[PDB]
Enzyme design. Structure first.
Site, PDB file in Angstrom:
ATOM      1  CE  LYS A  82      55.869 -13.297   0.711  1.00 43.98           C
ATOM      2  NZ  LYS A  82      56.366 -14.549   1.337  1.00 43.98           N
TER       3      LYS A  82
ATOM      4  CB  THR B 276       4.798 -24.733  58.965  1.00 41.52           C
ATOM      5  OG1 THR B 276       3.640 -23.892  59.024  1.00 41.52           O
ATOM      6  CG2 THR B 276       4.540 -25.999  59.758  1.00 41.52           C
TER       7      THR B 276
ATOM      8  CB  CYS C 116      33.500  -2.134  18.572  1.00 34.30           C
ATOM      9  SG  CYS C 116      34.252  -2.134  16.923  1.00 34.30           S
TER      10      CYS C 116
ATOM     11  N   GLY D  70       6.484 -14.404  58.644  1.00 31.61           N
ATOM     12  CA  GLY D  70       6.727 -15.035  57.365  1.00 31.61           C
ATOM     13  C   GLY D  70       5.756 -14.565  56.299  1.00 31.61           C
ATOM     14  CG  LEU D  71       6.697 -12.350  53.195  1.00 30.78           C
ATOM     15  CD1 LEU D  71       7.356 -11.703  51.992  1.00 30.78           C
ATOM     16  CD2 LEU D  71       5.613 -11.448  53.751  1.00 30.78           C
TER      17      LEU D  71
ATOM     18  CD  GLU E 238      61.080 -10.123   5.877  1.00 28.25           C
ATOM     19  OE1 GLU E 238      61.318 -11.163   6.520  1.00 28.25           O
ATOM     20  OE2 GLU E 238      60.441 -10.117   4.805  1.00 28.25           O
TER      21      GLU E 238
ATOM     22  CB  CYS F 267      38.446  -1.994  15.918  1.00 30.51           C
ATOM     23  SG  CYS F 267      37.287  -2.403  14.592  1.00 30.51           S
ATOM     24  CB  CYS F 268      37.118  -6.617  15.671  1.00 32.86           C
ATOM     25  SG  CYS F 268      36.168  -5.400  16.611  1.00 32.86           S
TER      26      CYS F 268
HETATM   27 MN    MN Z   1      59.655 -12.266   3.748  1.00 31.65          MN
HETATM   28 ZN    ZN Z   2      35.455  -3.504  15.490  1.00 27.51          ZN
END
Ligand code: MN
Ligand code: ZN
Ligand code: MG
Ligand code: MG
Ligand code: MG
Ligand code: MG
Ligand code: MN
Ligand code: MN
Ligand code: ZN
Lengths: 827, 827
Positions: free
Chosen positions: B181, B534, B252, B527-528, B174, B286-287
């Site tokens: 198992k 001032t 994704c 100035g704007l 393992e 993937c996730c």
């Molecule tokens: Mn085992």
């Molecule tokens: Zn994914």
RNA sequence: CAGGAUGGCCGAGUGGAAGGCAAUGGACGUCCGCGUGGGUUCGAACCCCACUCCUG
């Protein structure tokens, strides 16, 4: 004990025989199991805290076996995570079982400085009361605790009693501030002694508390210990010695020891003394208290050594080129740009030189590099010298290979076979890898394979597949760590990186400075020595082209010195002229005018200022640009230059950051400018030397500054020849060198005296400052080199006829040298 | 289920009866022990995720008892630390036991936002393979794992076979990729269903792997399951259902299911079919894959609810003002400065108004505030409305006490005793506390006690001592959080904080702008609207005094309008004069000149610019400062102003960032500037109006912009009076209001019509624009108000005789309003 | 550096709840329970780890 295997390019620790396999380890006795576990964990912690490496252990079976659940769990507690694959990978071949360890943290300034701990540890020895229990702080918990500590009740009623009644029920339970203990009639003193180390620090670290010995836990009844079996004086003495043995670390003043109150109180049964009960009140300690020294390990020199308490706390609370660390990506993309689809050899000049000197080296390297399709091969005369190690005669060159689908490989090419060549290459590779991790801050899995090659006609450890450079991201990160490593030493690539760093600083300061183009038409730029004045000028004229859409012939550049014009002209960003030519000829089509080294101009030939104003104010789209750069520290004559009075030179811009010289030369300029401030010339305006450099600005670029005196001209000239020969052997181009003398009337003498001493060093080509582009050493006067700069400079006998002018010559000289400066004063 | 108790100013969860004490909990059955533990942990997790609170549990005994070691350990797991005191504090009285829970994460943008997860969980239900074992990721491990997933072999040779021999010893152990198992002997299909979630997610989350069912874990023998015990096809169907039942979350596209290979292979014994062995190859996913829904809880409205898988992942992977958070320290020191040694009532205007409107309120408050020797008592007409709740008639005022050695207290004053008063006060205090935590980002232990008072003629929870504000540090932190809370709501203190935020923004812009003083003598500042021109002028006069060491009277300020002249004169920073006085009187004593609103000047009286140049460049200490502030968008006439041509206005500075008006007013100004640019005035050069405001700049201060058209004049003025009454009731002083009309001739008509309605609102007196420092409303024309600002501006019928100025008049009006602008255009 | 803890009581059981003073822990045939909490295992009172108290 544990020691590092000496014949490897990595930190390899041999821990000996270890039982591997869950069943085999279970069949062991607990003592042997725990001792083997402690050996393996010492090795793993040392490798984690020392840059990674390999653990080697012999296993009693020939077939593959799993590590074992207890070893697994200990590694998990070591990294504080179930992600073993991120830091530990294992291989096994026959009777040998290998664990490859990655570095816990890399570099002197990791991104996680204030987030993750500096060290992995087997135990921190820091205990705190956690409700009704005492718990040990893991590395993260101890890191946060020390970070906090470094920043700049009914129990007391019982505590005040003078005596207690046997069977007295205390009204409070065990809590965040209270602990009860009851002990045997025979071993009471020993139990109290072993109790102190585990509870006193826990109370001290977390807010204090009370420790009652002599109270039943379950019934909360006071019982004490029989008078016949405790001596109160001895017990108090032992308790105090016990508390004071505790190692305490401070971050404050005053540094007082752990503070507490101790009471041995009689327990009375029906009005007579039954025995004694011990009561300790522990005040909140101002800092961290350790029960014992932290169990953290590190590899120093060649032994696995345990960190002391103070050293551990120091690492857990707290040349390294910071500018290199900042610009590593730009520097890597400039120098070590990884190509797509082909293998690159760098530096090309040194590569060509080597393959010319040594016949067959090209074929050797090309046949050796067949496997690698994409990457970079970085050559050097000797990487050992590059990394501050000793030089080995007989080494043709060393090369570092960083290619896709391969581990880093450091080659050593020998002219003839040698047994010590492999040892030399292994030492170099070990140093390179340790630097890439500890100094370059690489956070991935890295190994450097040492492979000796010979031109004339113990196995290498096989690392996992994760140690191979999978692709562009890994190659780029490794090369960006190599950049930081190189910028800490002296070498050809280190100096090229320093040059690019200086260029990046200049680019930053120019980005700051160029915003004034929209806000000014007339501008008087007051620059300091080495402030980039000329580079800023050139970039500003490029920007004027870009903004006003006017062509280069419509922008005029005026300066005092022919070499500087000539340099500026080839850029094609302008028409460039001298002061006299500008005063003579017609420039009515010019819209914008830029003037440089204006402090060197003269009034005799005409009113150049007025001419520039007349030309610029006539521009159709309003008045044109008229920027006049100057530097009074670099004055070269005692007469007025035709500039307007000081009060009339507005608007202004001040270039105060030195960005064109390495740190030694910059400090030299800063020291010398005080000499000018102490005694300015009479013609210089009174208040124009009040400009000072930015206080904390530094370049972090290494250079060379040396002064040699009492030597004759022949000795000076031989020293110059020797230094140039060494630089060229290392790989520096001749166009990095310039020899600067006091005046042109000595230039023709020094040219002959230099060809004399350089014919023995195999280069016989020089020139004046008017042909900079040629690959040849420039010999000229200091003044004629105004506005120019070279990486290596040889200043020979600074001299002038009048002491009134003498002070500025040394600054005007030292400002020309970017990295390496050699001065030869009279003596 | 668990429900939040409704009658408290905090989140209180009643978990019923719980057995407390380690000895008591050891006598229970494990089922009851675990159920009680689950209830308490659910409550604790919900309170940690919901901003904190209290857990109420009835205890079965009268005497104090420790919480229990199992509960302690569950809490330690919950916070991933042995520092329980940081979050959990326990109090007990009689038959009740309380656990006070602090919030885990507070505020919308925590400082540890990317370091620590936002949620605490009982279990993340995320598993990964760690060599030979499967471990669950805690909060921190799962946070890092999700971050990593979100940012953009010989076992195969056994899997390739189609049959296996009973008792075959597989040649590998393992490992990270292999799990062995055996089959259960009783319920085979149910066992497989149980085990698939245990191991498939762990393989999927990290590198995949193989799961062999039917292989001895110790001897590595193939055993399988007897053919008479299971049906292979049914087993395959059940396994596929179990795998596809696993929760998954994606970061994704495409969002694909778990990819796996499942093989049921015959187990042969002496060639005859003995049974079946099951092999699953799990490809990396993937996730993230969950074994089940995460075990995280939160308070929703009033139910303790569980977070779903996607909701939990969303919280784990990730008006809230930003400028308030940035400046909290300075804003708190400005408004809520905590004084030493006395209690402070704020705001004083509202306090005085209240104690004048109500008899005996001063006595009520003073007699209630005897114990508190230091702090701040913040008043409001109704904190409920301040917090966007529903108002309650009969409430006099609400005061929020923040004092030393006391928890925050929210006082509600009623004229007459009421049963709903306590509910109103409790709801307000609960909302205030939840805001202080979840919106103000307070990270300490906070509670807001609700107290109700009356003029005319459920016990509170006793919080731990750590909830009292111990001194300046805690008071400052809580008030800095209250600043952020207030800045997200519309109220008097919110508007005051917005004003101070605008002042701080202008101070930043002035810090950028003011270094130009060293670099210029003559300067044109374009100035704007709302760019602070001032304010820059005033502050630059201060800096001129400071840096040139000249007396204040040596600096001259010249403007075009008498109100602006006076508003500058009263501050004594300089001598202020009009153009018409400047062109006549003697100013030889002057050194430096600052000219403002130059675009409104005129040439009929003389050459003001020529005079200014002559005075300044003759100055006795060399040429003096001559800065000409101007703004072409705010032109007030169509004639020539005497300014030098646009091409000759250099050097030039531009103030493009609007920092004087709230966000709505700023957006209105920005949009109107487009109309101005569309139709520029003929008396203005072609280029100036091509200065554009900073594109990405925003103020982050809330304000009111409302256009009320088609109204008649009487309706306009009744509305103005009503709005003024509402503001003055809420606490705004009248001097925060300015009423601006189109032109000065209609001033008297609109003034009479103003009094005709305002005298019904109990304020009679008004102020002229020449008396800005008065405590009365200012009524005047837009032109005469140029250069002046007030918080609330009423614009009545903006119009001009020549429509060509109509574009300019709207901006000249809007730029005067800091926060609240009301425009009343023509029908 | 080690050792103990079993049902009401005394006590046998170290990987497929004895006995002694008709039943004689529990939740709903499955599962929990042998000091408490976890782990490995097809299977734990039994093997491993942590913790509680006491003992050498
Ligand atoms: Mn085992
Ligand atoms: Zn994914
Ligand atoms: Mg027994
Ligand atoms: Mg037994
Ligand atoms: Mg048990
Ligand atoms: Mg069981
Ligand atoms: Mn205890
Ligand atoms: Mn105890
Ligand atoms: Zn200290």
């Amino acid at each position: 004990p544990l020691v590092v295997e000496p014949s490897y390019p990595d930190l390899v620790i041999n821990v000996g025989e270890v039982t591997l396999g869950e069943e085999n380890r279970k069949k062991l006795q607990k003592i042997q199991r725990d001792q083997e576990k402690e050996r393996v964990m010492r090795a793993a912690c040392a490798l984690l805290n020392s840059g990674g490496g390999v653990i080697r252990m012999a296993k009693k079976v020939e077939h593959p076996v799993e590590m074992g659940l207890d070893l697994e769990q200990s590694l998990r507690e070591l990294i504080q995570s179930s992600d073993l694959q991120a830091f530990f990978e294992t291989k096994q071949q026959g009777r040998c079982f290998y664990i490859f360890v990655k570095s816990w943290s890399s570099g002197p300034f990791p991104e996680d400085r204030s987030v993750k701990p500096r060290l992995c540890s087997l135990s921190s020895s820091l205990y705190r009361r956690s409700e009704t229990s005492v718990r040990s702080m893991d590395s993260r918990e101890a890191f946060c605790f020390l970070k906090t500590k470094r920043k700049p009740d009914p129990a007391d009623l019982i505590f005040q009693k003078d005596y207690l009644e046997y069977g007295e029920i205390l009204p409070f339970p065990e809590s965040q501030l209270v602990e009860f203990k009851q002990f045997s009639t025979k071993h009471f003193q020993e139990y109290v002694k072993r109790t102190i180390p585990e509870y006193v620090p826990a109370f001290a670290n977390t807010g204090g508390g009370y420790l009652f010995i002599g109270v039943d836990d379950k019934s909360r009844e006071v019982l004490g210990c029989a008078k016949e079996n405790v001596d109160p004086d001895s017990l108090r003495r032992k308790i105090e010695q016990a508390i004071y043995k505790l190692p305490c670390v401070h971050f404050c003043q005053p540094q007082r020891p752990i503070t507490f109150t101790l009471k041995i109180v009689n327990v009375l049964k029906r009005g007579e003394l039954y025995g004694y009960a011990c009561m300790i009140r522990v005040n909140p300690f101002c800092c961290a208290v350790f029960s014992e020294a932290p169990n953290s390990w590190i590899v120093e020199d060649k032994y696995v050594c345990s960190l002391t308490t103070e050293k551990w706390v120091g690492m857990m609370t707290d040349v390294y080129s910071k500018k290199g660390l900042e610009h590593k990506k730009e520097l890597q993309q400039l120098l070590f740009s990884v190509p797509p689809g082909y293998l690159r050899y760098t530096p090309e000049s040194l590569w060509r030189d080597l393959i010319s000197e040594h016949r067959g080296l090209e074929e050797l390297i090309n046949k050796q590099m067949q496997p690698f399709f994409r990457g970079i091969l970085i050559f050097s005369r000797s990487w050992a010298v590059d990394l501050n190690l000793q030089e080995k005669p007989g080494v043709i060159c060393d090369a570092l290979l960083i290619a896709q689908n391969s581990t880093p490989i450091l080659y050593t090419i020998l002219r003839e076979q040698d047994a010590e060549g492999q040892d030399y290459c292994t030492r170099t590779a070990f140093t390179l890898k340790q630097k890439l991790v500890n100094m370059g801050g690489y956070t991935g899995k890295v190994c450097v394979r040492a492979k000796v090659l010979c031109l004339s006609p113990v196995s290498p450890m096989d690392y996992p597949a994760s140690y191979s450079l999978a692709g562009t991201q890994h190659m780029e990160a490794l090369l960006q760590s190599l950049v930081i490593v190189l910028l800490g030493f002296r070498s050809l690539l280190s100096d090229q990186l320093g040059c690019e760093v200086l260029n990046l600083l200049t680019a930053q300061q120019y980005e700051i400075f160029s915003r004034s183009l929209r806000k000014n038409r007339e501008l008087f730029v007051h620059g300091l020595p080495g402030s980039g004045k000329t580079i800023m000028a050139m970039k500003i004229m490029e920007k004027i082209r870009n903004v006003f859409h006017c062509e280069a012939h419509r922008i005029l550049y005026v300066c005092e010195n022919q070499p500087l014009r000539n340099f500026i002209s080839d850029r094609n960003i302008c028409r460039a002229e001298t002061r006299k030519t500008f005063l003579r000829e017609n420039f009515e089509h010019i819209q914008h005018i830029v003037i440089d080294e204006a402090q060197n101009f003269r009034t005799e030939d005409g009113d150049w200022y007025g001419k520039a104003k007349s030309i610029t104010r006539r521009a159709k789209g309003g008045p044109g640009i008229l920027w006049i750069f100057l530097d009074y520290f670099q004055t070269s004559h005692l007469d007025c230059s035709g500039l307007p009075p000081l009060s009339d030179q507005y608007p202004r811009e001040e270039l105060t950051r030195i960005v064109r010289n390495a740190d030694p030369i910059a400090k030299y300029l800063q020291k010398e400018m005080q000499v000018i401030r102490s005694n300015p010339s009479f013609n210089i305006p009174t208040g124009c030397l009040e400009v000072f450099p930015e206080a904390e600005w530094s370049q972090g670029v290494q250079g060379t500054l040396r002064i040699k005196k009492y030597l004759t001209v022949e000795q000076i000239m031989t020293c110059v020849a020797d230094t140039c020969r060494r630089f060229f052997d290392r790989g520096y181009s001749p166009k990095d060198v310039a020899v600067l003398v006091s005046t042109a009337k000595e230039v023709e003498h020094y040219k002959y005296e230099l060809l004399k001493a350089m014919r023995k060093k195999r280069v016989v080509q020089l020139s004046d400052a008017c042909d900079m582009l040629g690959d040849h050493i420039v010999l000229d006067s200091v003044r004629r080199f105004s506005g120019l700069e070279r990486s290596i400079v040889f200043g020979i006998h600074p001299r002038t006829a009048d002491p009134a002018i003498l002070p500025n010559v040394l600054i005007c000289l030292a400002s020309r040298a970017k990295q390496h400066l050699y001065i030869f004063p009279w003596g």
